[PDB]
């Protein structure tokens, strides 16, 4: 009896009637047998929506919004709101200057997104993305928490969605939140949004330009376990694009300390980041040196063991540091002065894989540029193992070209051969025939270091004679006319010495 009567009073033509009928319907929604009666009525639900949608009074809105909000606390009531076309209307209400009305709408949508199938497609037609982002400037931290969590549900697995947020200026709005407020539940969800965006390749640079790197570094030592982990996955994703930002001297300090932790997911994420920000930046390379970065890193590899997802990033981080800058010398000396040479040569041997072995040969080349390391590296027994790897690669995977393993290995022996002791060892391994064969490579790089190592060994009578006996005179003459001043200068030297 009741329902059929209220439905009619909900839309006459004279408003006071509709404005006064809304107030009545609103109170019935707080009772159980009333809601059940209201839901199963395909007309009551419809009239309610068009009223909240077309009204012009405040409280009529304040009351109609509350009526739908209560209907959303249960499955049956959601399916009804859905059929009556209530979502397009709900979005419209997201522009009200009334707090109560704004704060309901958003929560009803939140519920629809979480348990009704189809909501996602719909909320996107109504255009709920530009609106939710426009609300990010309010000041109610609890309000924000609900809003940002709505952005994360819609942006997951959808690029069209990440691009609109981006196009509406989401990146330098969220970052602001992170360096202004302290509510934990807000800072957690806002990072969950930033994370999802860091995946694509267009949405990345917008974050680093705002200052997302410095704003995310702030919460690395907070009591929240989940906030510190989401912050870390995210800094690792941006890393390969922040290699030129000034004033990163602050964040680099913290990162180093974070190598010493009980959490091994915190060590792994911290490893890669230091590895990436260390690329081609003389200002970042030095700073890490001043805060004891070398000593800390050597220690990281020691406890890592055979876990190749920790060792790999770290080794690449020592490789960058021992090259191109004012402290590159100090760097090379320190790795030794901190008992690291032993473990470095151990990673060359199996269990290891190609990607890892590649980076260690590169670290070793740099380390040999310091005289004080000639004798040590030999005693650990690197030469005999370096040669062994050269062979198996020559003939032949995992993501590594075998020609790279050959160009690196040769250049390693090239620099070591600066000390007489090493030369006597290298030569006494029937290596010459192979070195001579590399002269025939179509790769100029391999030609320089091949003719280079020969230039070194040839400074000794016996050695020179054995080289000429293989027949290097033939290829060496052709390499004289190379336009590569390196491959040339070296071909003239070997011939001079063996004559």
């Amino acid at each position: 009896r009741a329902i059929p009567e209220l439905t009619k009073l909900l839309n006459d033509e004279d408003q006071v009637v509709v404005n006064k009928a809304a107030v009545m319907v609103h109170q019935l929604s707080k009772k159980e047998a009333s809601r059940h009666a209201i839901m199963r009525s395909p007309q009551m639900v419809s009239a309610i929506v068009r009223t909240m949608q077309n009204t012009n009074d405040v409280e009529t809105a304040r009351c109609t919004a509350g009526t739908l909000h209560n209907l959303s606390h249960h499955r049956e009531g959601l399916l009804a709101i859905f059929k009556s076309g209530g979502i397009p209307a709900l979005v419209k209400m997201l522009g009200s200057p009334v707090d109560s009305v704004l704060f309901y709408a958003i929560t009803t949508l939140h519920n629809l997104l979480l348990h009704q199938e189809g909501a996602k497609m719909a909320v996107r037609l109504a255009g709920g993305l530009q609106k939710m982002v426009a609300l990010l400037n309010k000041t109610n931290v609890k309000f924000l928490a609900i809003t940002t969590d709505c952005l994360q549900i819609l942006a997951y697995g959808n690029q069209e969605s990440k691009l609109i947020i981006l196009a509406s200026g989401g990146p330098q709005a969220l970052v602001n939140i992170m360096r202004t407020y302290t509510y934990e539940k807000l800072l957690w969800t806002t990072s969950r949004v930033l994370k999802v965006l860091s995946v694509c390749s267009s949405n990345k640079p917008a974050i680093v330009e705002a200052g997302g790197m410095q704003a995310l570094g702030l919460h690395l030592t907070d009591p929240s376990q989940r906030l510190v982990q989401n912050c870390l996955w995210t800094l690792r994703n941006l890393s390969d694009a922040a290699t030129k930002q000034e004033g990163m001297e602050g964040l680099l300090g913290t990162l180093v300390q974070l190598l010493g932790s009980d959490d091994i997911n915190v060590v792994t994420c911290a490893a890669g980041i230091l590895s990436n920000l260390t690329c081609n930046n003389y200002k970042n390379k030095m700073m890490v040196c001043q805060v004891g970065g070398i000593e800390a890193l050597v220690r990281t590899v020691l406890r890592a063991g055979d876990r190749e997802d920790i060792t790999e990033p770290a080794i690449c981080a020592l490789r960058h540091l021992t090259s191109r800058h004012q402290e590159a010398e100090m760097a090379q000396n320190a790795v030794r002065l901190h008992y690291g040479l032993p473990v470095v040569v151990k990673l060359l041997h199996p269990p290891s894989h190609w990607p890892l072995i590649k980076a260690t040969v590169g670290l070793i080349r740099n380390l040999a540029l310091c005289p004080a390391n000639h004798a040590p590296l030999r005693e650990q027994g690197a030469i005999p193992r370096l040669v062994q790897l050269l062979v198996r690669a020559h003939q032949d995977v995992e993501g590594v070209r075998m020609e790279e393993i050959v160009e690196g290995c040769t250049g390693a022996l090239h620099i070591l051969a600066r000390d007489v002791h090493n030369r006597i060892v290298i030569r006494g391994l029937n290596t010459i025939p192979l070195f001579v064969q590399l002269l025939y490579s179509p790769i100029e790089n391999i030609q320089r270091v091949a003719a280079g190592v020969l230039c070194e060994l040839a400074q000794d009578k016996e050695a020179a004679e054995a080289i000429e006996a293989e027949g290097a005179t033939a290829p060496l003459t052709e390499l004289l006319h190379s336009r590569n001043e390196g491959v040339a200068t070296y071909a003239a030297a070997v011939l001079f010495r063996m004559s």
Partner: peptide, 11 residues
């Protein structure tokens, strides 16, 4: 020389 690694694509 020093070359980066896009961790977004590895995980």
């Amino acid at each position: 020389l020093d070359t980066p690694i896009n961790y977004s694509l590895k995980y």
